[PDB]
């Protein structure tokens, strides 16, 4: 009888995508992983394991946290990986992962959202669909998937003011 | 940049909305435009309306007109949003057209209207836009977080899903 | 505190939801419970399910059973969520029952299902809960941000609204 | 031919109810008035004039701002008034308005939301429905309408930690 394969694993490191309002803080905190909400209603043929690695706010996120993400991605059986993450340091994590030889036969995609998923008008659900497809279809490597396109982490910056990733032009 | 994408809308469950005059759902404005409005896209996209007919009412003549319309696009990356009832019929017909052989054509839609809570539509649109950009030339169905070969796929009406034959 | 409120659910557009098996809307779980879950209430509320029938299918016998059910409540403040097609018929029938004469009974619902985008349901529920707490004993329809006298009201099916006669 | 009366006027002073995410701030700001969004889809028989008075964040809100709200409410022709406002100083504004003899024949209700309207799971739409009804049905006075009940501002406090208004018990 046919067994539907589950080629994709998702890891979550928090970020804007997962932010939610809490009364105590009178403001946003990093909440539960929004990617789980999106996949719950995606009516998937397979299944996707979603493993939560970290929810630190961006200021507290360290090298040691980035090392733990590399160990988790490297230890996964799956060769197709989506990491949801904050956009302010996504490029630094992507560049770090691109240097691990352990990742050489894996397609690893980083994504997230400029607007929290739990806020009206969020990019999150589109971005998760696009990034899931990217993780399945791209050749091995490390990529950022945002704005409905694929970015090379070595040639990308975050424009903090505009909430967009932009290519670094070759000179 | 990504390659320019052309999106055609042929109606279906994805676009259904409630109307007081009908006391129920009717095919309304294309939901894909609502999703892409907030997707903060970098690439070139253009959305064109083909139809708001029920996909069950499509004739062979209708499918021939959808094929000619996809062939009017310069773009080589195409998304067609469509009802799931006859998505396999339209997809198999397009896959037979030599005039489309250099294009990546992806059909998608939703099992639950985009304007109803808990819909698959926004995820499906993201997934299918990536698929239209990234897959080799051909015709495909992108639903349920996977890519289907139309020749080897059927719509299970009772289970609300696509399945391998 | 406010006086305890009892809420009865009799179905209707407010509670409609999409089902793949029907390829369309059916009366689902009461939407009023979804609204009150996030309303952070201070007062006593209890929600009881009466029916998920189409309001057009209500008989005189059904309206008599709704009257007896409202009379089983100790509470003197009652909200009944209901379809708009026969809301005036149920409301006029309840207004004729001496056994309800000390109760404030408010009927409400929605023109657009709560689970569809752009629905009036959550505003209607807030408004009707206030109305059930604050109005003098009687039977009322609370819709469109106002209070209607059932005896002097009709459902315009074509315009999707209630109106004075 | 029948003219539908419009007995209710709404004023907006910002608060949590109106908060929205902005990329530049990387967080919530006081946005456009959420009550307008709720009434847009309420299918009203009448109309409601919605007048925006202030969007200051809570720290910048002063006595002079509170005085301007009292002048706007007193000058309105309508005798049924809903003021949407922050919950942290709603009691102080309500007590201030309760002391204006100019308001004596008006029903004035203050409301808002513990969770921004543009965040998932908000109380805002319910609260606006309830508070509109309260403004129409209550006898003249100044009230807070939250948690599906009516509070007397002289006998109410905000519990900041729990996001709730509570009665001050008579001793
Ligand atoms: Cl914030
Ligand atoms: Cl329907």
Author numbering:
A (entry chain A), D (entry chain A): 1 to 171
B (entry chain B), C (entry chain B): 4 to 168
Give the text the authors published on this PDB structure.
L‐Asparaginases (ASNases) catalyze the hydrolysis of L‐Asn to L‐Asp and ammonia. In contrast, the chain of ASNase from Rhodospirillum rubrum, reported here and referred to as RrA, consists of only 172 amino acid residues. RrA is homologous to the N‐terminal domain of typical bacterial class 1 ASNases and exhibits millimolar affinity for L‐Asn. Crystal structures of the wild‐type RrA, both with and without bound L‐Asp, as well as structures of several RrA mutants, reveal topologically unique tetramers.
A distinctive feature of RrA is the presence of Lys19 within the lining of the substrate‐binding site. We probed the importance of this residue by mutating it to L‐Ala, L‐Glu, and L‐Gln. Crystals of RrA(K19E) were isomorphous with those of RrA(K19Q) and were obtained only in the absence of L‐Asp. The kinetic data, even when reduced to approximate turnover numbers, demonstrate that Lys19 plays an important role during catalysis and its mutation reduces the rate of catalysis by two or more orders of magnitude. Further studies are necessary to explain the differences between the activities of the K19A, K19E, and K19Q variants.
